[PDB]
Write a structure and sequence with these properties.
- Chain J: Belongs to the RNA polymerase beta' chain family.
- The structure is cut from a larger assembly and holds 3 copies of chain A, 1 copy of chain B (186 residues), 1 copy of chain C (209 residues), 4 copies of chain E, 1 copy of chain G (107 residues) and 1 copy of chain H (123 residues).
- Chain B contains 3 helices and 7 strands; from the N terminus they run ααβββββββα.
- With 186 residues, chain B is of the alpha+beta class.
- Chain B has a 5-stranded mixed β-sheet. Chain B has a two-stranded antiparallel ribbon with strand order 5-6.
- Chain B is elongated and about 95 Å long.
- The N and C termini of chain B lie far apart (89 Å).
- Chain G has a domain of 52 residues: Single Sheet (N-terminal domain of TfIIb), CATH 2.20.25.
- In chain G, 0% of the residues lie in helices and 14% in strands.
- In chain G, the strands form 2 sheets. A 3-stranded antiparallel β-sheet of chain G has the order 1-2-3, with no helix packed on it. A two-stranded antiparallel sheet of chain G has the order 4-5.
- In chain G, strand 2 and strand 3 form a beta hairpin.
- Chain G is rod-shaped.
- Classes of the chains: A mainly alpha (50), B alpha+beta (186), C alpha/beta (209), E mainly alpha (50), G mainly beta (107), H alpha+beta (123).
- Chains B and D meet through strand 7 and helix 3 of B and helix 2, helix 11 and helix 12 of D.
- Bound molecules: magnesium ion (MG) and zinc ion (3 copies).
């Protein structure tokens, strides 16, 4: 089905709860995965969510 | 009707075809210029397209206003008639006509000089009419008769007709809305 | 031209004579391989050849069972046959006292003749073909499985085996090309031997109706 | 090949045809007993010299050759002057001085009804049919058959457009019923005078409407037609269900048969209709939803346009003869399908007309565009057609600058201000066919004339609830649209007072942890419909 | 079928004669292979192959 | 499989041309056995394939060729005493076509279904030209009939066998042996196979009704089996051969190709109540009663 | 080409009633006497000449030069070409090859 | 036979160009001429004669009413003079208007500002 | 009946009918389509071939030639209509041996 | 069509080589790869599209047709023939589509949905006629298959 | 009806055929194993072979063509004028209208349109006289019915079972009550001895309504009485999904 959109949502959400924020997933925009992963490693979690 | 036919495909002679056609259709009898067969060359039937009315012989080009007038001045300097159509209403107000805000018209003006025609480098044209400039361009080209005439009603019962000439070109005159906006911003 | 015409003549003669061989009439092996140059030797070029008479053939007989049973082949010349020509054929027939003859038309014939072809006589039967058909022998084509007509005894045996009544058999149309080729009337039965995709074989039967 | 026009005005809806069944042309209309060769209509029409008809159609040799056959039948028939032609088409009149005037009247007022004429100066209608024929003959040159799906040719109607016809019918019927009873009473019932106020039947209007709205059937004897299923019960499953419904579009085709046509997606929809949101199943493609940023126009005055157009040099049509049309340098000028004159140097006309619009003299929604294959300029003013706003670009620099956005954010000015100052303008499907649009600033080149305000506004209101839609495969987005409506959630702050046939709620809902900007525009997160797992 | 919200019917034959036919002829055990060409149709599906 | 058919693309023999019907529409086409179809295709062999002898011309002898370009120009000849039509011939161009046509053949081709103009009305002044003389037919006709005599170059009615056209590339990959073919888009098997210089005995058609009329039933039912199997396999679905053998037998056991439709089914079966349950419920019943038909229940 | 009468503007017709043919009107006595020849027709119409000489027709058109195939190059296909539609449009070339069990015919 | 083209002709003016000067004149009207085909109708009429509480008025829209209206107007006849006649040059003298070459026109006082909304009145 | 507010009942569509002719299960699709849906009993007079009532044929005024049967209701309904359209289905019956 | 054939050839080999390259770089034990190899779910084409490069969007077996006059979207110049102006998508789902690509992708996807909806009736009808004629035939003890009569 | 009426000699009610052909087709009918399809084909064959004849050999009686003159209206063409020599019979028929020609002038323009109209009464009293030996050649089995009964004069009202109380009542009921109502109208109306014209016009509407009872699809209904609403005739409840 190639719903990569769900795989990103699950990571942006995780990195968003931990620091009290809402992330945006707007069409043709939204939070880039290159920033979200560097947010997670700050909180002691692995930078790809596994 | 024949059925046994052996065709041929070997190369033939072009001048032979020309000679055959010559013999078939070039045996002219035009020497039969008898009275009832005479044709006045100025009375021919005519091609559909007016510009190419030369279907049998005895045996338009691009233009621009600056060109037209300057040939009408340099190459020729005789008189000519032109038909031009002006904007709905002119810059003037109705002169002491007592007016509904009626548009002024040439029918309501006096005689004499009324303005100047200005030709600019690169062939741009403007009609200097009072305080405003109106752009001018040639109109749709014509190929049919347009005769200018004067209708003299000499009496209530009868009058007189005289042809004055024919019209060869048309001109279109328009306000320059861009210029008016530039002068008075909105 | 006159070489394509002779080619057509050669081919149609080949086919007609092959057909007569297949119906089981007298024919000589040395004719079977009559080559186109052999035809040119026996018959000259088109302008010298009289179509309506050069190719007529009646030597064929039903030697298989009756050497005294003869038949005719005719090659009319006019594009459409008329009543007079078929009457000429039928009176020639009466002079030779024969019951069967073949007809070939280059293009066709009058509908009046078409109507007549059903009612010459019960004892006189005339079969019509078109030049553009016999120019190929349909029996030689790959999509046509081998048809073999069989006698009354064989059909008796067959429908005794399966307990059939003859009307329960599948049908072959009376006017079908192959049936008309073999010249089989109503009520005859034909065996078909289909070529299997493999070395095996399948048999089926059809009733002429 | 053939051509037809569904000539329609305020009074009646009609149509006409042409046919090429053998090579000559003929006019087909319902009230004419048999098709008439075109040249016969032209001679009856008031122009009889064949030379002039050929001038009307064209001068180029092959078009004239292909028209040729279409006048041999004429010269076979003993039909040489106008009067004979009116007699001929009089004999051919169909009915549900008859031989002379009645047939003239029908032609004058029943054929090509939408183009007008007053004093039997039918030159105008001659040109119109001459254009119409010139299309068919030239159309055989290349198989560029018209695509009826192109949205430049689609109009939309609303509550007002519909209610108007219904009320006008009822009001006319109210007068007519008051009429015939008024006629019946006074002459016979009583010598002393009566008064109508004793017969103001009140129930007739009220009933006429409410049963029409409730039943959704709009029978009208005026047009001998009926429209079904024009209203639906508002759906209240969830907040987004009602909001979604209030932007839906229906279609006239009504599932009559499979044609593999309008169900597909054509680029004409760009920015006007949502790509992702369509009903799944048998209705797929017949039902559509408006994009997020769109406008539907309304009727205009039409006055100052025709006046202004006449000033910009367009000549009157009837002052010139047929031979002019074939020249390669003259363009025609239309107005809502009507012919308005002839012009040369069109690009000046278009450029000035756009500029006057930007200055605010002509209404904002009036559109002007060019067709180069037919060399016609189409000016359009009728309402019901869609529009989008774009930022204007000149010489590779946008009109709007950070200062303006600062002003707007602080609050000095408002959207409408950007319109007078010629910073943004409304484009229309037929007009955005002409310009070049830039998608982002860094893609601007020498020629871009407009710039998108925000590309994410391409999607609709239901489809804007997906996060990261541009990372999924397309069918997935279409499925979510239809299931977002069925979710269970909140409805509105008065939901505890509603008594309604069926209502689903959720106990402890929550707002999304990953949210789109369309979610904030429609206030979705004030009425959420889910829970984070 | 796919367990995405599907539905299925069910009938209970009412005659001893109909029980015998349903079991002998229509049973799954007797129908492991499709009659179109004889290939198997009842076999392992995803997440058993992995 | 019929419902499973997805109507896949790139079925164009790898050449993106020859838009033959395929998929469920082709299946309907075969089952219905309607005597008229779209895009019929015939194939043939002659003797040998490639380079420099005896083959390619045959192509130009049966496929499409207007009169047209064989005249470089068509020009008027009016002259005070009379006028007539002229047609030029480009013999040199013909030779490059090497169609066997010449002036005399064109002469013979005219006078077929053309206003009964006699051979004396037509004249040939040279191998490069042909001319025809106008005549008044008096049936709404006069000397000016010239316009209705404008019936010579592209389209009125013509010599040759009509209903044929062209065909295009279809290459092969297996170079281990040399193998090629001639295709034809037409609707006359009898004629094409009957042409001189073609190995007729291996021609076929994809129109079942066409083959029946020309080679008997057995050729017909073999065509049906071939075409079903070719369609299914092309779309990648596998079916046993014993299912298609039985379908073809049932369709062709009564002596004719009976289509599986209302007309054919009425011709196959006999019960009135069975027919009434399928289609045409009104007429079958009323007609049954009139005939007093007694029906078993089997 | 077409003509209209200068006097009345209708189409001319061609007829003969005297020693010399004439271009005449049908409503007014204007006429022109044709003494010369005019050279442009209406391009008449007759359908596709396909099987004029179908099949292995006469051998007079044999020729020497021929092309060759890129793949196999077996000894039997000599050249031929054909035309499109009418007097004023181009002519086409096809290279068709045919032994058995294939589909070749190159454009 | 003549045919009318437009009702108002105000915005049309004839012109005569000359070296160093150009003279205008308002047009009184424009008309189109076509050959008259009434004679076939006359022939038809001759052949045919040889062979052998009122409802709401609608006469305003009927053609023969216009004919009757146009018949009220009497005919006037006119003496023709061709271009070959010197009378034509005699008449042509009237196109030139006398006066000083350089004159400041009293009219056309309106400035470009006034002219813009003058020709474009408020909607 | 068919509804869900009304008590329901599912359908053996024409596709299911054909699947059971796929298996050749002759007694199952007699049971499903007749025994469980609309079984019915009627009286037919063998002498005149058309149905009567209560073992008495009003057409013949006799009871010596009546015999009962079991036939689906919808087929009995069909015989009523046809006999009303003046197309009579005179049915002839015999012992079951 | 010569040009189209050449452009389609080039724009297909671009995706193939990008598809091969990613798969060779793809470490074993990767999940989509495990599913693809064992045949439980997916295929190699899916993996290439999710990572490397979405293909050439095609409608009815051809590049995107002209929808406006001489172009597919106003965002491109007249008479252009370059890849992007006719439906090519150089963006893998991981890196997201740009607005015009997303539109062409939706345009290509919709055909499948309409197709599936349409196919409901035609094949049902074919099956109804076909079975209604064939139902009686039954194999016998005599090995013949015989019609009802 | 039109098929059978095209066969019969209008003078003697016989089939028109040669005795040899009668014997031949009798023997054809005696062929065993007659099939429905063969019945149809034979009907076509006999119709084709019979239509050629125009004289009844049994009594020398001439017969003309039979053709539908109007919707549910039939006409025979015995008294037809021909381009060939005028038949004495048609001249005798033509010359007999002098009285009406004198009374009314519009008779003269259309005296050539006088043919034999077919009404239920005349067909019924014709069919009744067909002889027994002929029927099976007409392919309708004499055990199934007789032509005389093909034209109807009575109807059954179906039981209340096949038309429940609440449809208020079924449309078949409302149709039937209308038929009887209109029937009662005719009988009282004719007894009331009014002008002929209505008596027959009233009968045509009854004919159409009786037709409309069986089936409700007929498209030939003129404008000013076409049903404004759709209705369930018999075939509508047999046919349909
Ligand atoms: Mg599912
Ligand atoms: Zn004239
Ligand atoms: Zn009884
Ligand atoms: Zn008799």
């Amino acid at each position: 089905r190639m719903t990569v959109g769900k795989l990103i949502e699950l990571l942006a959400g995780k990195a968003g709860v931990l620091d009290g924020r809402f992330h945006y997933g707007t069409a043709f925009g939204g939070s880039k995965v290159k920033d979200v992963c560097e947010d997670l490693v700050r909180h002691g979690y692995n930078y790809l969510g596994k | 009707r024949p059925e046994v036919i052996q065709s041929h495909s070997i190369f033939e002679q072009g001048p032979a075809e020309m000679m055959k056609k010559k013999g078939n259709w070039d045996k002219t009898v035009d020497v039969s210029d008898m009275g009832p067969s005479h044709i006045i060359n100025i009375k021919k039937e005519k091609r559909e397209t007016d510009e190419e009315t030369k279907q049998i012989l005895r045996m338009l080009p691009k233009d621009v206003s600056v060109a037209e007038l300057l040939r009408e001045l340099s190459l020729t300097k005789e008189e000519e008639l032109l038909f031009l159509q002006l904007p709905d209403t002119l810059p003037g107000q109705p002169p002491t006509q007592d007016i509904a805000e009626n548009a002024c018209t040439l029918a309501d003006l006096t005689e004499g000089q009324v303005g100047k025609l200005l030709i600019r480098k690169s062939g741009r044209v403007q009609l200097l009419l009072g305080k405003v400039t109106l752009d001018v361009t040639m109109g749709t080209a014509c190929s049919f008769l347009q005769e200018l005439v004067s209708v003299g009603l000499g009496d209530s019962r009868t009058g007189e007709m005289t042809v004055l000439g024919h019209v060869k070109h048309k001109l279109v005159c328009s306000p320059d809305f861009e210029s008016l906006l530039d002068h008075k911003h909105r | 031209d006159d070489e394509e015409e002779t080619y057509r003549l050669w081919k149609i003669r080949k086919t007609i004579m092959q057909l007569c061989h297949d119906r089981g009439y007298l024919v000589t092996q040395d004719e079977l391989d009559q080559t186109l140059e052999e035809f040119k030797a026996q018959s000259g070029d088109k302008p010298s050849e009289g179509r309506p008479r050069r190719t007529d053939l009646t030597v064929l007989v039903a030697h298989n069972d009756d050497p005294t049973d003869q038949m005719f082949v005719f090659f009319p010349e006019e594009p459409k046959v008329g009543i007079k020509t078929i009457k000429v054929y039928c009176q020639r027939m009466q002079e030779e006292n024969i019951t069967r003859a073949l007809i070939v038309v280059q293009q066709g014939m009058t509908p009046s003749a078409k109507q007549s072809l059903v009612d010459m006589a019960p004892k006189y039967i005339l079969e019509q073909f078109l030049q553009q058909e016999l120019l190929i022998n349909i029996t030689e084509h790959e999509l046509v499985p081998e048809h073999v007509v069989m006698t009354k005894e064989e059909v008796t045996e067959l429908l005794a085996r399966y307990k059939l009544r003859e009307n329960q058999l599948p049908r072959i149309q009376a006017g079908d090309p192959v049936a008309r080729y073999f010249g089989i009337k109503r009520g005859q039965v034909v065996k078909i031997i289909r070529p299997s995709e493999t070395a095996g074989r399948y048999i089926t039967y059809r009733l002429v109706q | 090949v053939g051509a037809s026009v569904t000539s329609s005005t305020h009074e009646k809806k009609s149509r006409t045809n042409m046919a090429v069944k053998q090579g000559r042309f003929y006019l087909r209309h319902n009230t004419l007993s048999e098709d008439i060769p075109i040249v016969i209509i032209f001679k009856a029409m008031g122009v009889e010299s064949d030379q002039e008809i050929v001038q009307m159609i064209g001068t180029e040799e092959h078009v004239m050759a292909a028209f040729g056959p279409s006048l041999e039948e004429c010269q076979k028939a003993q039909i040489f002057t106008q009067m004979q032609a009116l007699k001929y088409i009089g004999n051919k009149v169909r009915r549900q001085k008859t031989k002379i005037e009645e047939a003239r009247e029908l032609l004058a007022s029943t054929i090509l009804t939408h183009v007008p004429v007053k004093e039997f100066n039918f030159r105008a209608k001659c040109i119109y049919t001459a254009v119409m024929v010139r299309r068919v003959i030239l159309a055989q040159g290349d198989n560029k058959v018209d695509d009826r799906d192109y949205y430049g040719n689609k109009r939309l109607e609303l509550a007002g457009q519909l209610l108007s016809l219904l009320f006008e019918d009822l009001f006319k019927k109210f007068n007519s019923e008051m009429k015939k009873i008024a006629d019946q009473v006074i002459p016979k019932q009583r010598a002393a005078q009566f008064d109508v106020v004793k017969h103001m039947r009140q129930d007739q209007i009220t009933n006429g409407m409410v049963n029409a709205i409730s039943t959704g059937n709009w029978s009208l004897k005026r047009f001998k037609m009926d429209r079904q299923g024009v209203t639906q019960v508002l759906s209240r499953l969830s907040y987004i269900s009602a909001l979604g419904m209030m932007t839906r579009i229906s279609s006239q085709f009504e599932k009559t048969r499979k044609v593999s046509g309008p169900r597909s997606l054509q680029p004409s929809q760009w920015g006007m209709l949502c790509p992702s949101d369509t009903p799944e199943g048998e209705a797929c493609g017949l039902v559509k939803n408006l994009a997020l940023m769109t406008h539907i126009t309304t009727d205009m005055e039409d006055g100052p346009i025709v006046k202004l157009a006449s000033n910009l040099g367009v000549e009157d049509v009837n002052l010139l003869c047929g031979e002019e049309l074939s020249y390669p340098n003259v363009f025609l000028v239309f107005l809502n399908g009507n012919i308005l004159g002839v012009i040369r140097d069109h690009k000046k006309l278009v450029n000035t007309f756009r500029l006057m619009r930007r200055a605010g003299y002509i209404n904002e929604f009036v559109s002007i565009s060019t067709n180069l294959t037919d060399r016609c300029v189409y000016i359009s003013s009728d309402g019901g057609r869609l529009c989008r706003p774009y930022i204007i670009v000149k010489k590779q620099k946008p009109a709007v600058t950070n200062k303006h956005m600062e002003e707007l954010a602080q609050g000095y000015r408002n959207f409408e201000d950007f319109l007078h100052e010629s910073l943004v303008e409304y484009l229309d499907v037929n007009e955005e066919n002409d310009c070049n649009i830039a998608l982002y600033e860094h893609t601007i080149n020498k020629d871009t004339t407009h710039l998108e305000i925000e590309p994410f506004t391409l999607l609709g209101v239901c489809a804007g609830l997906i996060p990261y839609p541009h990372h999924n495969q397309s069918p997935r987005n279409t499925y979510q649209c239809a299931m977002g409506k069925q979710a269970m959630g909140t409805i509105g702050y008065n939901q505890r007072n509603r008594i309604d046939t069926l209502m689903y709620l959720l106990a402890y809902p929550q707002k999304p942890m990953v949210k789109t900007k369309t979610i904030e525009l429609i206030e979705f997160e004030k009425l959420p419909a889910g829970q984070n797992a | 079928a796919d367990f995405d919200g599907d539905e299925m019917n069910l009938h209970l034959p009412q005659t001893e004669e109909a029980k015998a036919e349903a079991l002998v002829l229509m049973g799954t055990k007797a129908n492991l292979v499709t009659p179109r060409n004889g290939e198997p149709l009842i076999a392992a599906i995803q997440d058993f192959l992995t | 499989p019929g419902t499973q058919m997805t109507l896949k693309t790139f079925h164009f023999a790898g050449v993106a041309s020859m838009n033959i019907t395929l998929g469920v529409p082709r299946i309907k086409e075969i089952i219905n056995a309607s005597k008229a179809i779209s895009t019929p295709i015939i194939t043939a062999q002659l003797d040998k394939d490639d380079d420099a002898d005896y083959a390619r011309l045959v192509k130009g002898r049966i496929e499409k060729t207007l009169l047209g370009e064989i005249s470089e120009y068509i020009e008027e000849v009016f002259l005070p005493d009379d006028c007539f039509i002229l047609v030029k011939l480009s013999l040199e161009r013909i030779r490059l076509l090497r169609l066997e046509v010449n002036a005399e053949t064109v002469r013979y081709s005219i006078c077929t279904s053309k206003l009964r103009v006699k051979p004396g009305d037509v004249a040939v002044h040279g191998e490069a030209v042909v001319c025809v003389t106008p005549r008044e037919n008096s049936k709404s006709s006069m000397y000016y009939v010239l316009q209705f005599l404008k019936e010579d170059l592209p389209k009125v009615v013509v010599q040759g066998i009509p209903e044929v056209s062209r065909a295009v590339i279809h290459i092969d990959e297996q170079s281990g042996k040399e193998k090629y073919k001639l295709l034809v888009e037409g609707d006359n098997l009898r004629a094409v196979m009957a042409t001189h210089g073609v190995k007729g005995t291996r021609t076929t058609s994809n129109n079942t009704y066409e083959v029946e009329k020309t080679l008997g039933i057995e050729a017909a039912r073999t065509t049906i089996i071939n075409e079903i199997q070719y369609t299914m396999v092309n779309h990648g679905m596998s079916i046993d051969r014993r299912h298609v053998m039985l379908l073809s037998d049932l369709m062709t056991y009564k002596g004719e190709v009976l289509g599986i439709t209302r007309f054919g089914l009425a011709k196959m079966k006999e019960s009135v109540l069975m027919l009434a349950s399928f289609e045409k419920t009104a007429d079958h019943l009323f007609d049954a009663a009139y005939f007093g038909q007694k029906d078993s229940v089997c | 080409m077409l003509l209209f009468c200068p006097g009345c503007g209708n189409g001319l017709i061609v007829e003969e009633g005297q020693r010399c043919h004439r271009f005449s009107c049908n409503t007014c006595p204007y006429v022109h006497n044709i003494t010369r020849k005019v050279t442009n027709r209406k391009y008449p119409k007759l359908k596709e000449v396909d099987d004029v000489l179908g099949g292995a027709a006469a051998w007079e058109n044999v020729d020497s030069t021929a092309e060759s195939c890129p793949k196999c190059e077996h000894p039997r296909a000599y050249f031929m070409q054909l035309q499109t539609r009418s007097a004023d449009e181009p002519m086409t070339t096809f290279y068709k090859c045919c032994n058995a069990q294939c589909g070749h015919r190159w454009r | 036979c003549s045919s009318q083209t437009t009702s108002n002709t105000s915005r049309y003016a004839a012109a005569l160009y000359r070296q160093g000067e150009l003279h205008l004149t308002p047009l009184h009207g424009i008309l189109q001429l076509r050959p008259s085909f009434s004679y076939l109708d006359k022939a038809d009429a001759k052949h045919r004669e040889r062979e052998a509480e009122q409802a709401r008025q609608r006469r305003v829209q009927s053609y023969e009413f216009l004919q009757k209206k146009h018949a009220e107007e009497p005919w006037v006849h006119l003496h023709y003079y061709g271009l070959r006649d010197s009378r034509s040059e005699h008449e042509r003298q009237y196109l030139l208007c006398p006066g000083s070459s350089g004159v400041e026109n009293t009219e056309l006082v309106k400035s470009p500002s006034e002219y813009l909304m003058m020709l474009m009145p408020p909607s | 009946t068919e509804g869900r507010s009304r008590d329901g009942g599912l359908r053996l569509g024409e596709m299911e009918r054909d699947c059971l002719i796929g298996y050749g299960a002759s007694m199952l699709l007699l049971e499903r389509l007749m025994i469980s849906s609309d079984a019915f009993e009627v009286d037919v007079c063998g002498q005149c071939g058309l149905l009567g009532y209560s073992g008495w044929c009003h057409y013949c005024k006799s009871s010596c030639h009546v015999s009962s049967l079991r036939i689906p209701y919808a087929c009995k309904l069909l015989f009523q209509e046809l006999q009303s359209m003046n197309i009579i289905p005179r049915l002839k019956l015999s012992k079951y041996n | 069509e010569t040009l189209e054939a050449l452009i389609l050839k080039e724009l297909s080999v671009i995706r193939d080589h990008a598809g091969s390259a990613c798969l060779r770089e793809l470490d074993k034990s990767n999940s989509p790869l495990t599913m693809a190899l064992c045949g439980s779910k997916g295929s190699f084409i899916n993996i290439s599209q999710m990572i490397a490069c979405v293909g050439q969007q095609a409608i009815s077996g051809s590049r995107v047709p002209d929808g406006f006059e001489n172009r597919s979207l106003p965002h491109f110049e007249k008479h252009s023939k370059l890849p992007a102006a006719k439906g090519f998508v150089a963006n893998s789902f991981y890196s997201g589509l740009t607005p015009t690509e997303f539109f062409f992708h939706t345009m290509a996807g919709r055909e499948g949905l309409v197709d599936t909806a349409v196919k409901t009736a035609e094949t049902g009808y074919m099956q109804r006629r076909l079975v209604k004629s064939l139902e009686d035939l039954c194999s016998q003890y005599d090995l013949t298959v015989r019609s009802s009569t | 009806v039109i098929g059978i009426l095209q066969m019969i000699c209008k003078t003697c009610c016989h089939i028109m055929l040669s005795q040899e052909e009668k014997k031949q087709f009798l023997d054809y009918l005696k062929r065993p194993g007659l099939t429905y399809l063969q019945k149809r084909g034979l009907k076509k064959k006999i119709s084709d072979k019979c239509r050629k004849k125009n004289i009844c050999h049994h009594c020398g009686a001439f017969n003309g063509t039979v053709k539908k003159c109007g919707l549910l209206k039939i006409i025979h063409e015995k008294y037809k004028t021909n381009k060939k020599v005028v038949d004495p019979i048609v001249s005798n028929f033509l010359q007999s209208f002098e009285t009406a020609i004198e009374h009314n002038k519009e008779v003269e323009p259309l005296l050539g349109r006088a043919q034999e109209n077919l009404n239920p009464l005349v067909v019924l009293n014709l069919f009744k006289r067909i002889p027994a030996e002929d029927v099976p050649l007409l392919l309708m089995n004499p055990e199934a019915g007789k032509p005389s009964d093909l034209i109807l004069t009575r109807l059954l009202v179906p039981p209340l079972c096949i038309r429940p109380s609440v449809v208020n009542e079924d449309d078949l009921t409302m149709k039937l009550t209308e038929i009887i109502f209109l029937n009662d109208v005719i009988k009282k109306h004719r007894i009331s001895g009014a002008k002929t014209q209505m008596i027959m016009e009233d009968w045509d509407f009854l004919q159409l309504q009786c037709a409309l009872y069986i089936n409700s699809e007929l498209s030939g209904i003129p404008l000013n009485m076409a049903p404004k609403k759709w209705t369930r005739g018999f075939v509508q409840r047999l046919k349909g999904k």
